[model samples]
Target: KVFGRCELAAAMKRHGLDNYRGYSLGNWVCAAKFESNFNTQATNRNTDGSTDYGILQINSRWWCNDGRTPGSRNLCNIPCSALLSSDITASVNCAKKIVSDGNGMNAWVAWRNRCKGTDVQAWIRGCRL
Candidate 1:
């Protein structure tokens, strides 16, 4: 299993994220912490109670919709391992895409904003990055 904080820092570094500010690392960490308790192996049951997996907490349903094929909506679906493994770089890049696609922190931003009015250090420590 991927340990959350260390891997996340490495991932951010790969994506040229050497520092945390203005809701970048802070936001990402909060999202991961809140979503999966920093657990990359985390999987939760959907409303339909189907399994959703990964660190970014991507739903298999979303992956399935990204294409059409067998096992499309399961962890056996596209690149699920890459999404789930200790490759925070890929995860961070994916988050950047979500940000660039006209919603800064659709996931990342939301999480960061949740801690916006609180103690920034607590948020950081809580995420352990």
Candidate 2:
């Protein structure tokens, strides 16, 4: 397991996630919480046979390659294992590219299912951004 929410917020801030790509810090934090519970090694297999990877839960269908999946756009040009690292640098960079592609956080089902329109302020509460 990683640390608490504050630590995650601090790391996101260091990664320029505070307001990059027009996404707020709360949006990222909320998505991370529901997607992977801040666990870098988290992976989930979708019903469609695609797997989500890392804290952001990026999908193999469009983001990273897991070697098992073929025709992965692999838009990040990085392996899915790279996203499971505790460093989070590669994950954050790939997430930035994903948001820049005009999907915003909408690319993440967790964002829509859990975070959208909720009072997400608590996500960054007490964190120095």
Candidate 3:
């Protein structure tokens, strides 16, 4: 599912993601925009032979199982495909787990490289949440 920026922000807020694990909604929105462009079905094969899945681009190397990747820790205890769905509940749950595990948004390289210290207010601009 592809969502407009505002739509994605609204959904994130409704999901109580405005301040999850000490991270702001704008950070989540910014990460998602760079990782997947709000497309739930997005996936990418990494040079490390792992795959990134879903809106947050959670990696198969540690968070999920894609079958093709061996030795995945699967801390999320979910199939990678579960993240690539229009309903973002599973993805959100897993993301929370990730943050609690101490990585926070830094788990996503896109967030570190692009969102950190940037003015991300526009990611949630015009969303009535």
Candidate 4:
């Protein structure tokens, strides 16, 4: 069974988020669900036609060069996602990087707090990417 972007997004939403160094059981479960649903092999084309690939939806050309290489393991920039190929930690970390200005869940917390209780999925509604 293959997973799609929507499922991955849903799973990420289900998993709660905390800063990278912190541990939250529910967040772990959320990441687990995302991994199980996708197990890597995620891919998408951006509005400008750039390719985003792998479990973390990494932008191969922009964020990392690995995905553009032939048979590269570190295809995703979020080390864990690249090494494990489907590690939820990688995906979570990648998400944090993309959202929190390379900070982690602090941006997520601010996004939620400042946005009046909007969750992860909801927060992405107006996001450019």
Which prediction has the highest lDDT against the true structure? 3
For residue 37, what is the lDDT in candidate 1? 73
lDDT of each: 0.54, 0.88, 0.89, 0.44
For model 3, the stretches where C-alpha displacement exceeds 4 angstroms are none
Per-residue lDDT of 1-129 in model 2, one digit per residue for the tens? 564798998898899998887678898899999999999999999887889999999899988888877666788999999999989899999999988887678988889999989887789998876
10 residues in a row with least lDDT, candidate 3: 99-108
* TM-score of each prediction: 0.61, 0.93, 0.94, 0.38
lDDT of 2 at 49: 82
RMSD of each: 5.1, 1.2, 1.1, 9.5
Model 3 per-residue lDDT at 11: 82
Cα lDDT for residue 79, candidate 2:
92
| Candidate 3 local lDDT, residue 115 | 97
Clashing pairs in model 4, backbone N/Cα/C closer than 3 A: 15-30
Q: Is candidate 1 or 2 superior in TM-score? A: 2
Off by over 4 Å in 1: 2-7, 17-22, 48-51, 63-78, 108-116, 125-129
Give me the runs in candidate 4 sitting further than 4 Å from their true place.
1-39, 46-49, 67-84, 102-129
Tens digits of per-residue lDDT for model 3 on 7-117?
888888888888888888999999999999999999999988899999999999998988888877888999999999999988988888887886677888999999999
- Which lDDT tens digits does candidate 1 get at residues 2-99? 46565665466557654433454655655777677777777666665444456667655544223423344432234645666655555555555455
**Candidate 4: worst-modelled 10 consecutive residues by lDDT:** 107-116
State model 2's lDDT.
0.88
